[PDB]
Design a protein around this ligand. Sequence first.
Ligand SMILES: OC[C@H]1O[C@H](CCCc2cccc3ccccc23)[C@@H](O)[C@@H](O)[C@@H]1O
Ligand code: NI
Length: 158
Amino acid sequence: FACKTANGTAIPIGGGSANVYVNLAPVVNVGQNLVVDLSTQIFCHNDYPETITDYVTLQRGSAYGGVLSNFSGTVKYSGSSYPFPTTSETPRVVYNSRTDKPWPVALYLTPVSSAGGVAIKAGSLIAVLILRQTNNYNSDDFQFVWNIYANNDVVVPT
Ligand SMILES: OC[C@H]1O[C@H](CCCc2cccc3ccccc23)[C@@H](O)[C@@H](O)[C@@H]1O
Ligand code: NI
């Protein structure tokens, strides 16, 4: 089991870390959502689908910088929604193919009332998403750690 990003980088068999940049709407008001859909960026696959089933969870989701201070959020993982930052590990998604499949994670961030001005700085760390992978074969239990960086400024109009 391993993962990669679109025109980007890879995390190999056995886990590791990688940095991911995301495009963000440049202006968002109180009451509107920034949607950060990572499923167009992170893709994972099973390396032996004929004898092994891989199980993949969102173990944890954490907010940093401008998101942590100026936004409340939810996360959607494979059709279900959770608070963001997260309060527990999700149910699992099955990886049963050698073909790249998206990692179905999306952040929904809404500015808090105290947000105004540049609420997220370009190039700043906004979130960490941990992918935890296990299987039905052995005791492999691996973390794939995705550091999410803002590509651009996000302004909350006053
Ligand atoms: O995605 C399927 C699996 O692929 C890798 C390792 C499988 C390699 C392997 C090791 C020892 C005995 C094997 C016997 C048959 C097939 C693979 C074997 C690891 O990423 C596992 O965590 C993962 O569950
Ligand atoms: Ni592979």
